[PDB]
Design an enzyme around this catalytic site. Structure first.
Site, PDB file in Angstrom:
ATOM      1  N   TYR B   6      31.575  35.892  47.586  1.00 59.65           N
ATOM      2  CA  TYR B   6      31.552  36.454  46.033  1.00 59.65           C
ATOM      3  C   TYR B   6      30.230  35.735  45.365  1.00 59.65           C
ATOM      4  O   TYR B   6      29.756  34.825  46.104  1.00 59.65           O
ATOM      5  CB  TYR B   6      32.854  36.262  45.378  1.00 59.65           C
ATOM      6  CG  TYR B   6      32.956  36.923  44.204  1.00 59.65           C
ATOM      7  CD1 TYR B   6      33.076  38.428  44.137  1.00 59.65           C
ATOM      8  CD2 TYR B   6      33.086  36.255  42.879  1.00 59.65           C
ATOM      9  CE1 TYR B   6      33.238  39.010  42.887  1.00 59.65           C
ATOM     10  CE2 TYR B   6      33.478  37.052  41.579  1.00 59.65           C
ATOM     11  CZ  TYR B   6      33.677  38.334  41.687  1.00 59.65           C
ATOM     12  OH  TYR B   6      33.713  38.987  40.323  1.00 59.65           O
ATOM     13  N   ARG B  12      36.825  38.364  40.653  1.00 61.32           N
ATOM     14  CA  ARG B  12      38.024  39.103  41.475  1.00 61.32           C
ATOM     15  C   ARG B  12      38.207  38.198  42.670  1.00 61.32           C
ATOM     16  O   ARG B  12      39.222  38.501  43.141  1.00 61.32           O
ATOM     17  CB  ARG B  12      37.471  40.445  41.758  1.00 61.32           C
ATOM     18  CG  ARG B  12      37.398  41.402  40.608  1.00 61.32           C
ATOM     19  CD  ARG B  12      37.133  42.531  40.971  1.00 61.32           C
ATOM     20  NE  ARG B  12      36.904  43.453  39.969  1.00 61.32           N
ATOM     21  CZ  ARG B  12      37.997  44.446  39.288  1.00 61.32           C
ATOM     22  NH1 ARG B  12      39.189  44.403  40.013  1.00 61.32           N
ATOM     23  NH2 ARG B  12      37.681  45.093  38.372  1.00 61.32           N
ATOM     24  N   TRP B 103      36.682  46.297  25.366  1.00 63.03           N
ATOM     25  CA  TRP B 103      36.393  45.622  24.038  1.00 63.03           C
ATOM     26  C   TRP B 103      35.356  44.781  24.399  1.00 63.03           C
ATOM     27  O   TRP B 103      34.088  44.950  23.799  1.00 63.03           O
ATOM     28  CB  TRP B 103      37.501  45.153  23.565  1.00 63.03           C
ATOM     29  CG  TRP B 103      36.898  44.218  22.488  1.00 63.03           C
ATOM     30  CD1 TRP B 103      36.185  44.701  21.335  1.00 63.03           C
ATOM     31  CD2 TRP B 103      36.984  42.894  22.198  1.00 63.03           C
ATOM     32  NE1 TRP B 103      35.847  43.554  20.513  1.00 63.03           N
ATOM     33  CE2 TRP B 103      36.336  42.305  21.133  1.00 63.03           C
ATOM     34  CE3 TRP B 103      37.561  42.024  23.135  1.00 63.03           C
ATOM     35  CZ2 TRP B 103      36.246  40.931  20.822  1.00 63.03           C
ATOM     36  CZ3 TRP B 103      37.584  40.620  22.718  1.00 63.03           C
ATOM     37  CH2 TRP B 103      36.882  40.097  21.616  1.00 63.03           C
TER      38      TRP B 103
END
Lengths: 210, 210
Positions: B6, B12, B103
């Site tokens: 990653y 994640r 958002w």
């Protein structure tokens, strides 16, 4: 008995219905209109549909439900690693469905038209080619060289994407077409497709292939 | 041995790393920069991170990886129905993160201000109230009245949401704070949080709570 609470369409509940039918698990298909849904929403665990009623419980989240029911229908893997492969295929199908939905449900027309080229020519082919390579490697399934709930998710996704894109999405994907055929050949799935209600707003109905 | 491929941040992969640490499953945390990612992406099964390298396989899809690894770490359920309780909780947390992320990363300010109001005033409290009722009912866990991988997902979501909202989100959710405490009290998780790299882009770090 199982009860499937959803709107009157082959939406997130269609894979639930098809897995229940595969397993010959007797169930009620409770089809709720949008007004009844507005009235029900404050009582729904997430204010969302679909819900599985089981043992007096209202259980939300369709993918979790599908994984759960797959154990009852022998659609699950035999070990942790087969389950991981199915989960990977399901999430890959869900990623594909999400990009196409993001484009299709985009409401600013300028963005939608710009997004259309990239969605139809790049994303959809990218994900389908990966699934095609898996279908080839597994003899006509997306995982485990046998029917699993990943294949039901895929068949329902095929129907959904066909209605959103106005095309047969598997025309260039012969191993995924074999997956489709292998699943449509399953008697309980054929029966479900014949028995289920017709939605006249659907141009792509699997009923025409059985 | 496991490899977690990653980027150098608590993305994640953080739930993957924390689950591996819980189980004492030896792993290398391979943190790849974006340039290396630019070169590597064509070789990634989905062109995406995280990936688990295991037994020579590059396995994508963090949630499927986490579910798989939960069996190895004794973080999974004992039966299909406890697993359903865990999956439902995980998907509810992912829905919360989705609304708040939608958002937070919006860049056109007009959609952003409206999303701020609806997200902060409606969705976040709604999902937190649901998670809170379950946490109360299960004695300080989010599922199964015991540590499960759902609780690790929740702890990492707490960190992520805290950084997006710049506030402690659980101050008014005492049972979810008890979940947080119960999980931070676990020796291998505390050890991981102490050991793990500092990310200067995080203003909210759990390192300050241990």
């Amino acid at each position: 008995t199982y009860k499937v609470h959803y709107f009157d369409f082959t939406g997130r509940a269609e894979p639930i219905r098809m897995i229940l039918s595969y397993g010959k698990l007797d169930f009620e298909d409770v089809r709720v209109s949008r007004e009844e849904f507005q009235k029900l929403k404050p009582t729904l665990p997430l204010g969302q549909l679909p819900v599985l009623e089981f043992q007096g419980h209202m259980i939300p989240q369709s993918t979790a439900i599908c994984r759960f029911l797959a154990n009852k229908a022998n659609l699950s893997g035999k070990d942790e690693f087969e389950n991981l492969k199915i989960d990977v295929a399901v999430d890959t199908i869900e990623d594909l469905k999400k990009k196409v939905s993001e484009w299709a449900y985009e409401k600013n027309e300028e963005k939608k038209k710009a997004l259309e080229e990239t969605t139809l020519k790049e994303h959809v082919p990218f994900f389908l080619k990966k699934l095609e390579i898996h279908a080839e490697k597994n003899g006509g399934y997306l995982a485990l060289n046998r029917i699993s709930w990943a294949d039901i998710i895929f068949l329902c996704a095929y129907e959904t994407l066909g209605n959103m894109l106005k095309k047969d999405i598997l025309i260039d994907y012969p191993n995924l077409t074999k997956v489709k055929q292998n699943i449509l050949e399953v008697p309980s799935i054929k029966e479900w497709i014949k028995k289920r209600p017709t939605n006249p707003m659907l141009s792509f109905d699997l009923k025409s292939q059985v």
